[PDB]
Design a protein around this ligand. Structure first.
Ligand SMILES: [Zn+2]
Ligand SMILES: [Zn+2]
Lengths: 105, 105
């Protein structure tokens, strides 16, 4: 869905960002103040002592019910960055059919 | 597969233990020295000032490649206890097609 697609549904929050002109090592992702801050900078030599630098920053609001301890981010072979996090479950019927048993370590 | 079924495959380790005569609060699960230690004790009044206590302990070896930080345990409506943990992935082709990007917090 173009350069940037942000989907937020009952179970998860996902950002898809096209960064095809970048290398994986050029990207940083940082979460602060309920924002996702994504940066990239990529430099290339061009003919006759030229060069090009491409750079971006994208700030996205993180939904308040995303679990910030379960965030993940990956870059696909074709240069799509996916950032995602699960939403914290509704407590309705928590433990109704199956019940969690604590595992002590 | 009877009282106790232990399955260990490429991706996970799972114990299924029938504890139908127990209540959820009667069970404890503790991991120590690469063992899972499961205990239950359940007491019931019976007629004419009688009572019955049922108790068990089951120790299971945890495979060395299970991720002990990702263990889970649940009790089903019909009284089956499931303990499971994922195995740590093989590193072969880690990041080959899609690459993890660190999320700094
Ligand atoms: Zn390049
Ligand atoms: Zn009972």
């Amino acid at each position: 869905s173009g350069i940037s697609e942000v989907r937020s549904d009952r179970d998860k929050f996902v950002i898809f960002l096209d960064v095809k002109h970048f290398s994986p090592e050029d990207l940083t992702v940082k979460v602060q103040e309920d924002f996702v801050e994504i940066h990239g900078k990529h430099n290339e030599r061009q003919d006759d002592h030229g060069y090009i630098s491409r750079e971006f920053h994208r700030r996205y609001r993180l939904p308040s019910n995303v679990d910030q301890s379960a965030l993940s981010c990956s870059l696909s072979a074709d240069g799509m960055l996916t950032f995602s996090g699960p939403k914290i479950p509704s407590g309705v019927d928590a433990g109704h059919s199956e019940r969690a048993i604590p595992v002590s370590r």
